[PDB]
Amino acid sequence: IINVLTSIVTPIKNQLDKYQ
């Protein structure tokens, strides 16, 4: 679950990174 939750955060955080 934790690595999976982090697997969900991965794209979102990088999406933000790309957005910023």
Quickly list DSSP for 1-20: -HHHHHHHHHHHHHHHHHH-
Q: How far is the C-alpha of 17 from the C-alpha of 9, rounded, in Å?
A: 12
User: Which residue's structure tokens are 């955060």?
Assistant: 9
Q: Which of 16, 10, 18 is nearest to 2 (CA)?
A: 10
CA separation for the pair 13, 7 (Å, rounded): 10
How was this structure determined? It was done by NMR
End-to-end Cα, the chain, rounded Å: 28
- Please compute, for residue 7, the number of CA atoms within 13 A of its CA located in the half-sphere on the CB side: 4
Q: Output b/e per residue, 5-15; b: 16+ Cβ within 10 A.
A: eeeeeeeeeee
Q: Tell me how far the alpha carbon of residue 5 is from its chain's centroid.
A: 9
